[PDB]
Amino acid sequence: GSPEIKSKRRQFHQEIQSRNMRENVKRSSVVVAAATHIAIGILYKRGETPLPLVTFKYTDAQVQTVRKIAEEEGVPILQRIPLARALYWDALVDHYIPAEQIEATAEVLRWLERQ
């Protein structure tokens, strides 16, 4: 895949998703955020997901609502600006994380295990 086809895949898999925001937050393990700009959902369940999965991407004021819902549902949210940005631009929703984001995502999930 060319960068162009990657961009088509990203847009398509965003558009085909049929989940509301609460459902997306609730099914996530953790939210990686850049406050007021980005929220990315990550799902990782040992022996279910072979790798962390990106569940959602929201932006701007939607991040406020994600924070409100995450608090209600007991999903932790962490400020990781570079990871949030990289996943925003490069990840495909409902797919495993890109290789380049493995190290940073594992660091978040070690934190999550401690939480």
Place this chain on the structure above:
Amino acid sequence: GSPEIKSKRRQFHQEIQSRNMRENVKRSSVVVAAATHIAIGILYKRGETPLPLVTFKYTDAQVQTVRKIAEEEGVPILQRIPLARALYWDALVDHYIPAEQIEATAEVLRWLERQ
């Protein structure tokens, strides 16, 4: 305005816009892009617009379509990754550019005047 209200304003002014992509490209002076990721429209007309105005923001595969339409309509497109990103995150559509982007936007418009 707090960063939170800025994010609400960005999202609102995006949602209230009622223009299609061709109309947005056609009314722009130049498109600032990060290929396969971002396209931002800029309008600047001396004595009409006191400052450059952000006309649109598109992402992912939509950038391909913006490039196709820009070619048809004679609107130049320039790769400026840092400016495209900064406008993506911080600018309000249908408003003048943020102060921090004045220098980089003026550089693009000097180029445009030469074109």
